[PDB]
Amino acid sequence: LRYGLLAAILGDKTTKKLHEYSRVITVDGNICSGKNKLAKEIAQQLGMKHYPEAGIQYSSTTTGDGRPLDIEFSGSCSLEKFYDDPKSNDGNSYRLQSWLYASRLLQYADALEHLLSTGQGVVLERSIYSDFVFLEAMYNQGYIRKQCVDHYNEIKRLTLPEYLPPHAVIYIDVPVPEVQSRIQKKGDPHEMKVTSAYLQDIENAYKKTFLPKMSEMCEVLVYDSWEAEDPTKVVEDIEYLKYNKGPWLKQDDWTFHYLRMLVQDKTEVLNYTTIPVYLPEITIGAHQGSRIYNSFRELPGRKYAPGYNAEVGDKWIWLK
Amino acid sequence: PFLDIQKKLGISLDRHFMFLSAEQPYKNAARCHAFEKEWIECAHGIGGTRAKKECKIEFDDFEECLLRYKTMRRMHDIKKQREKLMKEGKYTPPPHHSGREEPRP
Amino acid sequence: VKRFFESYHEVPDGTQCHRKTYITTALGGICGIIGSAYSVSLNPADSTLEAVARVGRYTFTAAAIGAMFGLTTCVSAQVREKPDDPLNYFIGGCAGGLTLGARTHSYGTAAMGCVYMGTAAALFKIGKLEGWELFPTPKV
Amino acid sequence: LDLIWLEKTIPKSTSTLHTNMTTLTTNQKGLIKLYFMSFLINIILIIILYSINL
Amino acid sequence: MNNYIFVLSSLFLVGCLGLALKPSPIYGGLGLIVSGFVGCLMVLGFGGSFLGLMVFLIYLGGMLVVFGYTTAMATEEYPETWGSNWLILGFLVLGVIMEVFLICVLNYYDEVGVINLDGLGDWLMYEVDDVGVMLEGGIGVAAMYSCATWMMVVAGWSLFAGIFIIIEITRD
Amino acid sequence: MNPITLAIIYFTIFLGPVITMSSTNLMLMWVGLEFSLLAIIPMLINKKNPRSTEAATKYFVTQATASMIILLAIVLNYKQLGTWMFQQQTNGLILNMTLMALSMKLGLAPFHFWLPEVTQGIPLHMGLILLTWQKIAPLSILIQIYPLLNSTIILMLAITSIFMGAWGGLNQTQMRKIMAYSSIAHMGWMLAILPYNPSLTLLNLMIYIILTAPMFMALMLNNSMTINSISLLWNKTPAMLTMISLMLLSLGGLPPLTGFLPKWIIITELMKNNCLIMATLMAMMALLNLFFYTRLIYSTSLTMFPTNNNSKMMTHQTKTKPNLMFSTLAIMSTMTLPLAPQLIT
Amino acid sequence: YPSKETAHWKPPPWNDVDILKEKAVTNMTLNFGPQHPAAHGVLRLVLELSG
Amino acid sequence: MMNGRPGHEPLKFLPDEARSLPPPKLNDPRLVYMGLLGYCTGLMDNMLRMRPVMRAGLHRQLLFVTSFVFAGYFYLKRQNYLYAVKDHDMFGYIKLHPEDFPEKEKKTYAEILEPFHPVR
Amino acid sequence: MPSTFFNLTMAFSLSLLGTLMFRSHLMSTLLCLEGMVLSLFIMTSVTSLNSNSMSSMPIPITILVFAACEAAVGLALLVKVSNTYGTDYVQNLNLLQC
Ligand SMILES: CCCCCCCCCCCCCCCCCC(=O)OC[C@H](COP(=O)(O)OCCN)OC(=O)CCCCCCCCCCCCCCCCC
Numbered sequence A: 001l002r003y004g005l006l007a008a009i010l011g012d013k014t015t016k017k018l019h020e021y022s023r024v025i026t027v028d029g030n031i032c033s034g035k036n037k038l039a040k041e042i043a044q045q046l047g048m049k050h051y052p053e054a055g056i057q058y059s060s061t062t063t064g065d066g067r068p069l070d071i072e073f074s075g076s077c078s079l080e081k082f083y084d085d086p087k088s089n090d091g092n093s094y095r096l097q098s099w100l101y102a103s104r105l106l107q108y109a110d111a112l113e114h115l116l117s118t119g120q121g122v123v124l125e126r127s128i129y130s131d132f133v134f135l136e137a138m139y140n141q142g143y144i145r146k147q148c149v150d151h152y153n154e155i156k157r158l159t160l161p162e163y164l165p166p167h168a169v170i171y172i173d174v175p176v177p178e179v180q181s182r183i184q185k186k187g188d189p190h191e192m193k194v195t196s197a198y199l200q201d202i203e204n205a206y207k208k209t210f211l212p213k214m215s216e217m218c219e220v221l222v223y224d225s226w227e228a229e230d231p232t233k234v235v236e237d238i239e240y241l242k243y244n245k246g247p248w249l250k251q252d253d254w255t256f257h258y259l260r261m262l263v264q265d266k267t268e269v270l271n272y273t274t275i276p277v278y279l280p281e282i283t284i285g286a287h288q289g290s291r292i293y294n295s296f297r298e299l300p301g302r303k304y305a306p307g308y309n310a311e312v313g314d315k316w317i318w319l320k
Numbered sequence B: 001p002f003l004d005i006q007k008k009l010g011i012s013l014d015r016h017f018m019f020l021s022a023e024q025p026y027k028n029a030a031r032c033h034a035f036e037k038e039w040i041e042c043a044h045g046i047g048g049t050r051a052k053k054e055c056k057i058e059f060d061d062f063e064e065c066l067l068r069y070k071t072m073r074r075m076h077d078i079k080k081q082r083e084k085l086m087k088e089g090k091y092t093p094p095p096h097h098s099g100r101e102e103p104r105p
Numbered sequence C: 001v002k003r004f005f006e007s008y009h010e011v012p013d014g015t016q017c018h019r020k021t022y023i024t025t026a027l028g029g030i031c032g033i034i035g036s037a038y039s040v041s042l043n044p045a046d047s048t049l050e051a052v053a054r055v056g057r058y059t060f061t062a063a064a065i066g067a068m069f070g071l072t073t074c075v076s077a078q079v080r081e082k083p084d085d086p087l088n089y090f091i092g093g094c095a096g097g098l099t100l101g102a103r104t105h106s107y108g109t110a111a112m113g114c115v116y117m118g119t120a121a122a123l124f125k126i127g128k129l130e131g132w133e134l135f136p137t138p139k140v
Numbered sequence D: 001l002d003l004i005w006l007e008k009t010i011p012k013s014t015s016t017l018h019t020n021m022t023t024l025t026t027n028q029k030g031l032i033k034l035y036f037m038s039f040l041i042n043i044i045l046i047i048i049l050y051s052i053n054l
Numbered sequence E: 001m002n003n004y005i006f007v008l009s010s011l012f013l014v015g016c017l018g019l020a021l022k023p024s025p026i027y028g029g030l031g032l033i034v035s036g037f038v039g040c041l042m043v044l045g046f047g048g049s050f051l052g053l054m055v056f057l058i059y060l061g062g063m064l065v066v067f068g069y070t071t072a073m074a075t076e077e078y079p080e081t082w083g084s085n086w087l088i089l090g091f092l093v094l095g096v097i098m099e100v101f102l103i104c105v106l107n108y109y110d111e112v113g114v115i116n117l118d119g120l121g122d123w124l125m126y127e128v129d130d131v132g133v134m135l136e137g138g139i140g141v142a143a144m145y146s147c148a149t150w151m152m153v154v155a156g157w158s159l160f161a162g163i164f165i166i167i168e169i170t171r172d
Numbered sequence F: 001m002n003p004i005t006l007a008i009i010y011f012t013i014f015l016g017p018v019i020t021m022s023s024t025n026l027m028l029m030w031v032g033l034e035f036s037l038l039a040i041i042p043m044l045i046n047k048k049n050p051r052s053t054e055a056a057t058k059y060f061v062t063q064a065t066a067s068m069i070i071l072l073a074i075v076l077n078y079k080q081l082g083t084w085m086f087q088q089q090t091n092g093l094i095l096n097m098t099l100m101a102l103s104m105k106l107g108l109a110p111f112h113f114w115l116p117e118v119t120q121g122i123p124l125h126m127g128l129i130l131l132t133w134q135k136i137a138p139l140s141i142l143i144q145i146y147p148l149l150n151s152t153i154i155l156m157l158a159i160t161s162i163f164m165g166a167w168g169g170l171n172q173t174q175m176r177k178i179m180a181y182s183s184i185a186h187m188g189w190m191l192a193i194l195p196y197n198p199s200l201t202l203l204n205l206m207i208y209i210i211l212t213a214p215m216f217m218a219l220m221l222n223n224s225m226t227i228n229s230i231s232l233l234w235n236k237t238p239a240m241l242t243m244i245s246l247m248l249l250s251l252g253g254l255p256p257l258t259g260f261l262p263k264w265i266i267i268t269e270l271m272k273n274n275c276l277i278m279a280t281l282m283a284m285m286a287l288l289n290l291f292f293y294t295r296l297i298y299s300t301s302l303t304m305f306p307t308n309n310n311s312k313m314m315t316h317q318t319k320t321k322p323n324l325m326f327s328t329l330a331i332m333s334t335m336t337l338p339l340a341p342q343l344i345t
Numbered sequence G: 001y002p003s004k005e006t007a008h009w010k011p012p013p014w015n016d017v018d019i020l021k022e023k024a025v026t027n028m029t030l031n032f033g034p035q036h037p038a039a040h041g042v043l044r045l046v047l048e049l050s051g
Numbered sequence H: 001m002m003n004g005r006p007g008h009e010p011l012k013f014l015p016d017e018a019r020s021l022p023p024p025k026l027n028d029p030r031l032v033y034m035g036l037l038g039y040c041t042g043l044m045d046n047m048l049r050m051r052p053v054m055r056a057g058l059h060r061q062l063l064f065v066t067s068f069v070f071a072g073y074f075y076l077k078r079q080n081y082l083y084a085v086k087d088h089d090m091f092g093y094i095k096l097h098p099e100d101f102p103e104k105e106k107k108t109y110a111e112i113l114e115p116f117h118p119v120r
Numbered sequence I: 001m002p003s004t005f006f007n008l009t010m011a012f013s014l015s016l017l018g019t020l021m022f023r024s025h026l027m028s029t030l031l032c033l034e035g036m037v038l039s040l041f042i043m044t045s046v047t048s049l050n051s052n053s054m055s056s057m058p059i060p061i062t063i064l065v066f067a068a069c070e071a072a073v074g075l076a077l078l079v080k081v082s083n084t085y086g087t088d089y090v091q092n093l094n095l096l097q098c
């Protein structure tokens, strides 16, 4: 970790390196509603770094060689199995939800570190402030239980208020039958095996909780599909947005420095996602944990620290 | 002191006002300056243990110099014995102890 | 009171049983007042009446332990005609432990107090016979 | 003897005594009013002990 | 005039008794203000007026700040004074009675110990320089600038550090 | 927390005990204690949550009351003897109230009721700086006046310190409370040896400091404040469990760990001064200390507690947290027993 | 080691922050006027003040 | 307890009289164990930072071993001086006060009568 | 002087008794602390004036400075307590027991 108090004293001031487009903009919508291309085009034509939706293998892609690892290393949770049978007795649904929240938290830490280190803004797809919607959809559809909901709320309470909220939240309003039609047109059969009640629960979670609680603390951009599927007018709105609220105004150099330390040391980022609350949906046990851990250390490029693995071409090991 | 930076470097940050017989502003000696001086020069070079036994005479002089416990007890008895004699009337105060004296410069 | 607990030992054991019982009862009562004060201060009662009731209970229990210990020690010394023998103090400590167990209404605490207080009183008697120093002044 | 009474006598009784003792010593209410009243009792007892030791 | 210092010390003890008995902090600050005034009077009686006047001024500013904090946040709807509670006034009169009893015991039983009725007023000023200039108590406090520069720098560093301490605590 | 305040506060924390140790004046020792307390308050309140607010308030009132009792003792000694040092004939009452105030500053029983509460609710590094740095200057003051202090009051304070430290460490589950009660037991040992040999008190203080520093570093590795939190260390950081076991056994004081050396030499000198009863009771309560240490070792190292899913992502990430001084202090606090004649004087 | 007098205890939070009940803000209410030189005699301005 | 002795200078690691002592041989088990402790410290550091145990940080291991040997040598010289001056003060006090340390005359096993305790 | 010093010792003793016996108000505790400070100041000043120790006359000013720093930090902690709980009642600061 090169950055630190000494680097801040020698001069790495975030407010010095900020500019007019140093914004966190999160695009959010339903399961299949114009979200991936919109964020990509916004980032492309405003010169920000685009971050797609943090999937199951996000940590695997951002660490090591970047190849997607085996699922037992990357969470032992399957979106396809959740779509096939959401009420399974192995606890796949809440395992997938918690793993996706951890991946989104890692992506938020990476985006915040990039913003506070380089000054370039970030365009996220469906950040950590819009994952309780999938929580409440699973809970209202009976897929998970109240203990899982309380555990997720506890992790969200421990990990949420240490970061800053996004500068702009863009929302795509697409109705449930249109989501049905787009999912049927996409062609993934597991994704066809979903319910309009589940999608309606997602949209209800949006409209009843996500939109106002970010409305009171950042700029909200609820747009229809026809206002969307045309990522230029939204860019003009983003350009002529005025940010006169939220906690980004009261931030200064040293608050940015401590936030940068927190987001650059990833162990403190994912510290409270590994709380020892022994929920049977998430807990593994000694034998399976040791087998998976030993296989992960015997995986190529993962036995030692990055830069010390001689099997992948690291050199001058004896001099460092 | 637990650590002796002041003794090693030769400075006296707080060693020069540790007691009454130390340096005083404008050469105004404190009370019992000579009695404390007799105690310090007695106890130097013999250690704390030998100071309590062999410098008892100088310390006992210094203690009731500063505290005057024996002075008050001696002076109280004179006032107590005089006041007892006034009830029986076999003593009278002199004029110079009754406020009618011949003053001198 | 230093003269009081010194006058505990001015007579050999098996003599002045009433005196030894009375001084031991006073010492146990003092220890009970200390323990009751600590208990009331750390764990306050619901009312001043409950607090003074707990102080009375603790003081009476500790005074009963001390009285039974001293009484049984002196009676054992008189019956067995040997004062300098720690088994008398062991019997007294067991009697104090059974008194504690009777006040707490549990035979397990009765036996536990018997063994521990008998061992402690036997060690006390051995130390007073052979000059053990509990709080020695530094000499080396 | 072995599965009942020696176990009831030495190890389990020692464990029970120390568990009861640690419960009684750490049954605290977390109130510094009580803590400072306890400190006052400690000060009073130390004054008494010094006065009787002389 | 001989027992003037004794009367002042008794008044100071009474003020400290009220302070320990703890009325509402308005009245606690008032009692400690009059205790500071009495302590100023005792320092002026024993000698140099500088120390007593300085502690009077310092506690005037200090309890200005204490009163401001009390009316800000250390207040309740019904403040508690010495006489509004029967128990507090009971320990007040009990403390006065016990002070009188204690000085009577030290007068009678212990004879010339710490308290003597006949010896009162005879041992206030022990020895004074009859002829002499620069004998006041402010000369030593001035000599803190010259003789105890370590004392000066630790007091100044305490105040500077404390400014930083208060800024960091009340940063919120 | 800008570097100006960081430098001022940390320099004052350093300067307090240095002034206290370097001063031949009892008043300057007192003002060094004032610097230490007043400087460490903002570092305690730094998290700005209600638990640290309670901890800072309790710490402030406790150390303030102890400081005023120290000042009473100093002023009474200055009235009695005219000097600014307890030289040889200061009053035993003055010496005993000095001992009371310095003991309540240190945090030993029965003045120990605040120490687990204070070290709970503060961050782990603040617990480390508290339990290590704040206990040198009061022990320095106690070392300065060792032949004058009351052996009976010190010995009873030591016994009750080790007893309640062992019982508290037996009871609690929280790491910071466990190290607080461990600290109380260790101050019990240091005070127990203090009237007879202050060099052994310094040796025990240094051994305890180099024992409790890397345990706190290992706690800072993952912010593990719970028995379960340190139990999933086998999935978090498996290369440290052996050092945790060895350091906790050294804290318990077994041979051939070098933490046996302070207790061994302390009871050697105590039996040289004929207090075998006192030494025996201290040793058995040290065995109880080792019992809660062994329960901790069973929880964290010898068994493998169940782990959760997000620990896979934590193992995916990399850390540079453990510093250069962790391994040095761990090795010097684990395997330094054959250097016992060099460690003692 | 749960007992009767300590069975009501809860574990401490993992981040050392306890959720307390939101205290009602006691912003004071001032009847500025009507008998006031600045209220022009006939204005009952009630003021919710913080400080 | 030696801090109040006559001619005690304050706060120096090695006084001039210590130079009169024979220095450590520099190949002795105390310094060898200090170097071994430094090597184990380096290996512990490598394992904790997840480097190869001895195939990484050779300069770091060399620095650890050398610094441990250096500090151990100087500390060992200091404790050798301290034990020497302790024995010197002991023998000086023994010579200065011979009436408190009398040469007791121990009799032989023909004048002393040890009691016999049979085992049977 | 001995009667005055005994009265000052008793004043400090009752102020310490009040400090050790908390009531509902942390500011009342701090006021008892300041009464202890004033008692100590008065002792030190009358002792220096009795012994004519102008070398020790800086000691009362030093205890005034350091104890006022203590008072400042105590008021800062009390404003933190009142901001957190609405009042400065010492029974609110009891949730660190578990
Ligand atoms: C015929 C010969 C007669 C004479 C010789 C008699 C003595 C023989 C040797 C003694 C043997 C003692 C054995 C002690 C250990 C066995 C008890 C034990 O294992 O207790 C376990 C229990 C904790 O169990 P835990 O893990 O919490 O829960 C169970 C499942 N989870 O633990 C607990 O609940 C608490 C355990 C406390 C620690 C016990 C070990 C230390 C004991 C220290 C004794 C101090 C004595 C002096 C005390 C002061 C003076 C009275």
Ligand SMILES: Nc1nc2c(ncn2[C@H]2C[C@H](O)[C@@H](COP(=O)(O)OP(=O)(O)OP(=O)(O)O)O2)c(=O)[nH]1
Pocket (backbone or CB within 6 Å): A029, A030, A031, A032, A033, A034, A035, A036, A037, A053, A079, A082, A096, A097, A100, A101, A131, A134, A191
């Ligand atoms: N159960 C669950 N599924 C999630 C969660 N987050 C994302 N998913 C699923 C929903 C989809 O099946 C899949 C991809 O999501 P997207 O919204 O990115 O859809 P896609 O990229 O196909 O289209 P779009 O972005 O809408 O243009 O991931 C979550 O937290 N829980």
Ligand SMILES: [Mg+2]
Pocket (backbone or CB within 6 Å): A035, A036, A053
């Ligand atoms: Mg997409």
